């Protein structure tokens, strides 16, 4: 029904970007919102659109937002260690690894991610989240964890590639619960909820064959029943559209997906 | 009515991005679609979402789209000069400035822009589009400012990069990408010559300014004076559809003074 939780931005533009002001010759970044307005701790665990790629070493590419410079390349490359104790976005302060010579309002994204440092040589576990600042005391804390429902149902994640090496040499896929277009649509059109879940159909737009049926829970995640030990929904083609079939109860038994 | 024109992508993700195969040790990038698919030259001037930041030098960053690397930093920095005759996206090939060490499928965006080279010191004019190497043309039709003292209204976003005047590097736009995605999703038919949009402050429900949306897909207004216009309007407002209007609908001028 369309209330973003945690640090979900409305649009893709402010999705993984962060903005802040840093003093010259210092590595502390005082976070602000993407539009430049001051960030409030009690609003959210982090400024809207703050990255949540946990268990990895960020590598940012900041730049001065007003673009005062006239000659040189404005891209400044630094790295952030979310496992470090100084990584406290809830307190509107994160410390970069390297000092930045020029002070000013900096805006940047995550360029690539490496396996986390000072963490026993663990792999880039994109399914975990960085330990934000102390949020139990404040009203705004992390969004509740989405546990997988029973009835042999598994949460379906949408995977996109981020640059950066991983210990296994596998593609670096960042999983997400819902596509950002769906989140924007839900935010814009705040339709109410009439059932414990929404029965989505993954249908090929042209051939109109029902590739598989998915349940959309009000918490904002898609679940499915894999057919067997096979990967299940991963075999599905990407040229498909989810169509809302009906409102269903929680105990609805999905037809197994995949072969 | 939700019909994209030119190299317009549906979602923001495929904006200012390009994917292609380049042989090791070379500098020519053979463009493909963003999803690793062959690109049809006849359908579009360029692969979907290919940048149109013309009259400026692109400084791209690239990485292999399957992460086959376990050790080193995957981003490779290169530059593309659109004014060069070798920059021909229509023929699915653009040549980077520097050589690329290892071959493979590289995805990449525009990291920053600099004033165009080989142009007599011209500034980074973002109001022009690259040549695209077209040879009939399937480009999006050029939008002209209508008469009746109407001027097209553009939306500006900052891309990093220097400019000859030290001013913000704001790129113009015709319609926010969320509007484009909504139009594509909701193929609402056009029932009038133009759509009158009210710019309403959500908290106070006050129409700060009124705008005309043309079926071509661009938003126009009427400035109160040469020194004012939509720039004074607060950014927190939301466009609310009001009615279908004829081309001769005379808007109330926006701005002050």
């Amino acid at each position, epitope marked *: 029904d369309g209330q973003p939780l945690g640090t979900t931005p409305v649009s893709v533009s402010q999705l993984c970007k962060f903005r802040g002001r840093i003093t010259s010759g210092q590595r502390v970044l005082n976070l602000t919102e993407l539009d430049g307005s001051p960030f409030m701790a009690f609003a959210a665990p982090a400024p809207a659109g703050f990255p949540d790629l946990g268990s990895c*070493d960020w*590598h940012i590419e900041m730049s001065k937002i007003p673009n005062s410079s006239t000659q040189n390349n404005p891209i400044v*490359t630094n*790295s*952030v*260690k979310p496992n470090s104790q100084q990584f406290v976005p809830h307190l509107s302060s994160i410390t970069l*690894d*390297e000092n930045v010579s020029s002070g000013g309002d900096y805006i940047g994204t995550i360029q690539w991610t*490496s*396996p986390p*440092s*000072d963490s026993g*040589g663990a*792999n880039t576990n994109f399914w975990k989240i960085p330990d934000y600042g102390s949020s139990l005391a404040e009203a705004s804390q992390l969004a509740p964890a989405v546990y997988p429902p029973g009835f042999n149902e598994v949460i379906v994640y949408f995977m996109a590639s981020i640059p950066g090496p991983n*210990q296994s*040499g596998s593609p670096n896929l960042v999983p997400c619960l819902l596509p950002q277009e769906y989140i924007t649509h839900f935010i814009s059109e705040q339709a109410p909820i009439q059932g414990e879940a929404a029965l989505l159909h993954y249908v090929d737009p042209d051939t109109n064959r029902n590739l598989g049926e998915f349940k959309l829970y009000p918490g904002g995640y898609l679940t499915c029943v894999p057919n067997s030990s096979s990967t299940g929904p991963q075999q599905l083609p990407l040229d498909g559209v989810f169509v809302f079939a009906s409102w269903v109860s929680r105990f609805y038994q999905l037809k197994p997906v995949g072969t | 009515d939700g019909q994209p024109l030119g190299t317009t992508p549906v979602s923001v993700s495929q904006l200012c991005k390009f994917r292609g195969r380049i042989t090791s*040790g070379q500098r020519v990038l053979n463009l493909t679609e963003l999803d690793g698919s062959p690109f049809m030259a006849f359908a579009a001037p360029a692969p979907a979402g290919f940048p149109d930041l013309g009259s400026c030098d692109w400084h791209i960053e690239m990485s*292999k789209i399957p992460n*086959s*690397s*376990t*050790q*080193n*930093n*995957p*981003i*490779v920095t290169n530059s593309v000069k659109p004014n060069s005759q070798q920059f021909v996206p229509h023929l699915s090939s653009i040549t980077l400035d520097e050589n690329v*060490s*290892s071959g*493979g499928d590289y995805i990449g965006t525009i990291q920053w822009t600099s004033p165009p080279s080989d142009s007599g010191g011209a500034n980074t004019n973002f109001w022009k589009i690259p040549d695209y190497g077209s040879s009939a043309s399937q480009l999006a039709p050029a939008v002209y400012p209508p008469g009746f003292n109407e001027v097209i209204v553009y939306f500006m976003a900052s891309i990093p990069g220097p400019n000859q005047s030290g001013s913000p590097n704001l790129v113009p736009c015709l319609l926010p990408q969320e509007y484009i995605t909504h139009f594509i999703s909701e193929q609402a038919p056009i029932q009038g010559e133009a759509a009158l949009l009210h710019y309403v402050d959500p908290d106070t429900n006050r129409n700060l300014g009124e705008f005309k949306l043309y079926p071509g897909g661009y938003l126009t207004c009427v400035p109160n004076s040469s020194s004012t216009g939509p720039q004074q309007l607060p950014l927190d407002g939301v466009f609310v559809f009001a009615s279908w209007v004829s081309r001769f609908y005379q808007l109330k001028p926006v701005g002050t003074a």
Partner: antibody, heavy 120, light 110 residues
Framework: EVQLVESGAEVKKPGASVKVSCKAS????????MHWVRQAPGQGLEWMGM????????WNAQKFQGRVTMTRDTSTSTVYMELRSLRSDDTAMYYC?????????????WGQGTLVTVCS | SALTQPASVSGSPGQSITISCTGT?????????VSWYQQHPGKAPKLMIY???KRPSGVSNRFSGSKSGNTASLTISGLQAKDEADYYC??????????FGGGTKLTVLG
């Protein structure tokens, strides 16, 4: 042209800690990972770990786990190797080597080598 | 651990020689990145073969490495004296570490 040079040959009393540097120039420091390779006289090459020039990121072999401590300096574009409790077998030809290419993933560009010596 | 390698293999000039590097599945078989090396006794080692069969610029086309199951092999054709050096194989282990081979010896008896 890109080359790696290091501190030089050192002589150390076993039980202390040795400090080895590796000057890097002619390329973007943070772009390429730096590895450390040792070769004992008459023995094969050994790999004592890797250092990410971009913000720490140390991964070292289990047989040398807890023994080596590697850090980098972004200002001087120099990577530091620190090994404590040197033993009789620890004397070796200490090489710092970056990869030939970002996507090559093979040590192609090696240093001149440093000779830490142990007698005991 | 360390890749098991032959202690020394020799061949006369003219007849191509093949040196094989052996390891477990986690070392060589699991991952496609194996690097083949060669070290002049006084000079620093450089790169012959990387990514199983890909060759960096600056080394002659005669060198060619391959991976066969759990065993990786390097082929040298038409040997001369300048190839007399120890060859080292290295593979990316499953422990997120690079592990070097034992170190083989080749001497041209001509």
């Amino acid at each position: 042209e890109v080359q790696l040079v290091e501190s030089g040959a050192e002589v150390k009393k076993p039980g202390a800690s040795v400090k080895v540097s590796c000057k890097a120039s002619g390329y973007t420091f943070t772009s390429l990972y730096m590895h450390w390779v040792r070769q004992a006289p008459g023995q094969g090459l050994e790999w004592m770990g890797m250092i990410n020039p971009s913000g720490g990121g140390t991964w070292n072999a289990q047989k040398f786990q807890g023994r080596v401590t590697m850090t980098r300096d972004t200002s001087t574009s120099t990577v530091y190797m620190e090994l404590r409790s040197l033993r009789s077998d620890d004397t070796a030809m200490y090489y710092c080597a970056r990869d030939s290419d970002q996507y090559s993933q093979g040590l192609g560009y090696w240093g001149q080598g440093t000779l830490v010596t142990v007698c005991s | 651990s360390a890749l098991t390698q032959p202690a020394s293999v020799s061949g006369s000039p003219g007849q191509s020689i093949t040196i094989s590097c052996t390891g477990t599945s986690s070392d060589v078989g699991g991952y496609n990145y194996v690097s083949w090396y060669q070290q002049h006794p006084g000079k620093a080692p450089k790169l012959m073969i990387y990514d199983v069969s890909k060759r960096p610029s600056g080394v002659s086309n005669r060198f060619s490495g391959s991976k066969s199951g759990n065993t990786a092999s390097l082929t040298i054709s038409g040997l001369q004296a300048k190839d007399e050096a120890d060859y080292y194989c290295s593979s990316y282990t499953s422990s997120s570490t690079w592990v070097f081979g034992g170190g083989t010896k080749l001497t041209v008896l001509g």
